[PDB]
Amino acid sequence: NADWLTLNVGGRYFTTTRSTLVNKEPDSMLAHMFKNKQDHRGAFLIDRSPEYFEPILNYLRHGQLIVNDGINLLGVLEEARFFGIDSLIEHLEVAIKNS
Amino acid sequence: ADWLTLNVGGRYFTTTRSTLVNKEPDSMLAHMFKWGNKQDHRGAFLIDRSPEYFEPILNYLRHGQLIVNDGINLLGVLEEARFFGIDSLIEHLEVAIKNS
Amino acid sequence: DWLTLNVGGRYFTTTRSTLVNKEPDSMLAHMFKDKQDHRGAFLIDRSPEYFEPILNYLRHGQLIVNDGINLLGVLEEARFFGIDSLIEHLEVAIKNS
Amino acid sequence: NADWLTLNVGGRYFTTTRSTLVNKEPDSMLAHMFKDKQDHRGAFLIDRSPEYFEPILNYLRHGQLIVNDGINLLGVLEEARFFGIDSLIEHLEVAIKNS
Amino acid sequence: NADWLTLNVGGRYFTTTRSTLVNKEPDSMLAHMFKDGNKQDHRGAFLIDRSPEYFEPILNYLRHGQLIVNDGINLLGVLEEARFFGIDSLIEHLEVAIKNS
Numbered sequence A: 001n002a003d004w005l006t007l008n009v010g011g012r013y014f015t016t017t018r019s020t021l022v023n024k025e026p027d028s029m030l031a032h033m034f035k036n037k038q039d040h041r042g043a044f045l046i047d048r049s050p051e052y053f054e055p056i057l058n059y060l061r062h063g064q065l066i067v068n069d070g071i072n073l074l075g076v077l078e079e080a081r082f083f084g085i086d087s088l089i090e091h092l093e094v095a096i097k098n099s
Numbered sequence B: 001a002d003w004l005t006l007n008v009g010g011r012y013f014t015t016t017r018s019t020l021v022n023k024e025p026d027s028m029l030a031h032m033f034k035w036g037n038k039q040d041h042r043g044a045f046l047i048d049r050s051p052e053y054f055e056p057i058l059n060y061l062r063h064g065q066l067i068v069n070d071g072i073n074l075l076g077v078l079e080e081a082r083f084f085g086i087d088s089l090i091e092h093l094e095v096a097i098k099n100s
Numbered sequence C: 001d002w003l004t005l006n007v008g009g010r011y012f013t014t015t016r017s018t019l020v021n022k023e024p025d026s027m028l029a030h031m032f033k034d035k036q037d038h039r040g041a042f043l044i045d046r047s048p049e050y051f052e053p054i055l056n057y058l059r060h061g062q063l064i065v066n067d068g069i070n071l072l073g074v075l076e077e078a079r080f081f082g083i084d085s086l087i088e089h090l091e092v093a094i095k096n097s
Numbered sequence D: 001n002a003d004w005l006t007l008n009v010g011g012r013y014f015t016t017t018r019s020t021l022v023n024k025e026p027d028s029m030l031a032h033m034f035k036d037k038q039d040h041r042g043a044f045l046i047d048r049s050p051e052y053f054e055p056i057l058n059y060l061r062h063g064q065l066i067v068n069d070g071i072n073l074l075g076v077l078e079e080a081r082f083f084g085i086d087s088l089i090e091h092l093e094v095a096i097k098n099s
Numbered sequence E: 001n002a003d004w005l006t007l008n009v010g011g012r013y014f015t016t017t018r019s020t021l022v023n024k025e026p027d028s029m030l031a032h033m034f035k036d037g038n039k040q041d042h043r044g045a046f047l048i049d050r051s052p053e054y055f056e057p058i059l060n061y062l063r064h065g066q067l068i069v070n071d072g073i074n075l076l077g078v079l080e081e082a083r084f085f086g087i088d089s090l091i092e093h094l095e096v097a098i099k100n101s
Helices: A018-022 A029-033 A054-062 A073-083 A086-097 B017-021 B055-063 B075-084 B087-097 C016-020 C027-031 C052-060 C071-081 C084-095 D018-022 D029-033 D054-062 D073-083 D086-097 E018-022 E029-033 E056-064 E075-085 E088-098
Strands: A004-009 A012-017 A044-046 B003-008 B011-016 B045-047 C002-007 C010-015 C042-044 D004-009 D012-017 D044-046 E004-009 E012-017 E046-048
Touching: A004 A018, A012 A018, A012 A054, A018 A029, A018 A054, A029 A073, A054 A073, A054 B075, A073 A086, A073 E056, B003 B017, B011 B017, B011 B055, B017 B055, B055 B075, B055 B087, B055 C071, B075 B087, C002 C016, C010 C016, C010 C052, C016 C027, C016 C052, C052 C071, C052 C084, C052 D073, C071 C084, D012 D018, D012 D054, D018 D029, D018 D054, D029 D073, D054 D073, D054 E075, D073 D086, E004 E018, E012 E018, E012 E056, E018 E029, E018 E056, E029 E075, E056 E075, E075 E088
Parallel strands: A004 A044, B003 B045, C002 C042, D004 D044, E004 E046
Antiparallel strands: A004 A012, B003 B011, C002 C010, D004 D012, E004 E012
């Protein structure tokens, strides 16, 4: 809420808050990352896909899985696994059971 | 007349204060003209939301109409509409999702 | 003569000639005959996503868009900026979609 | 020749080589442009659409027409005519004959 | 893991690690970053004259060894880049992917 952070994911810059990253849930890699490496703009470097990082950060923001038509849910699942957000993994699995 | 830049999720939007304050003024968005969110390096006011689902919001602020392209999940628009507190667009969106 | 436009946050670049020749009767051409930001770009409080087909139509006089984009979005910028011919093209385009 | 060139197309920056812009289309406007109008970043200014310019540049790169679903081929055809690359014009016309 | 690199592909900047570029395909031309590539822009990114739009799935496959793209994406554009950079496994994967839509 008060502490602003910038994340360099794969070359794309996201801006968020520490509170968003460490809360809901605190038991993910992401949360333990921000409590390393610095790029040329101060942002913290992450070697993943930013295209499939959007729904991850959004789910961190409001706890809901929202995505546009045609977007492969497998990538989102992969990134969710990497960062270790369990709830989103479950939601994604019950989402891929019936597509 | 008075131009503002917003940093939403890492994406920069340029508009005017008039667009944000007017139509409608009983949202937190309009209330953000009085808040310690101003400082990034380009002077843009920081907002921790999805920029992808923010463009229809700003456009609705610009011309009072809901326009999005095919395949766009307007649930994500509804969530932003709730967060920023634009009630008219919330209604618009609900009657929009009633039959899709 | 080169100009840069800041539309809704997105920077487009085009000659003044394209903005003024064809569509000499509405606000776009009338703006550029002679308010700016740091990069010297002319500020426009509209949607850039629906602004690209407008500028394309200014460039070669044709309405070309990919599958899925809402023609209403293009029509709203077309009304705002005031390109009559493109408004006609768009209306006859929405007649049968 | 074989210098790294930057093109400012419609406000979007593309990076390539002179070789790519000259060879496999020596009889086009593009090739005729780069043998010897710059913005501040030194990029050469082109007043066209970048969204329909990427497939053009790609065709320059590997001589093939590749485009995602839903992309209007007409927009590519117009740029194809403007830059005067006849082979790609032919490809495009036989591509629009059956869509 | 520790060594960060920026690639300028066709004008678009990707950021990754040398580890990702040289492991899980050390015999592809990309592994020419197994040494340090003496062509750099002003920012310092290594220049590559290809399409960035079809470079995303390549780099992602380098990252987690899986072919993941959204609906409507022309797989041919990915195949061309895979051929250029010389990732054979991805070429096989793509070939068995295209012969049945």
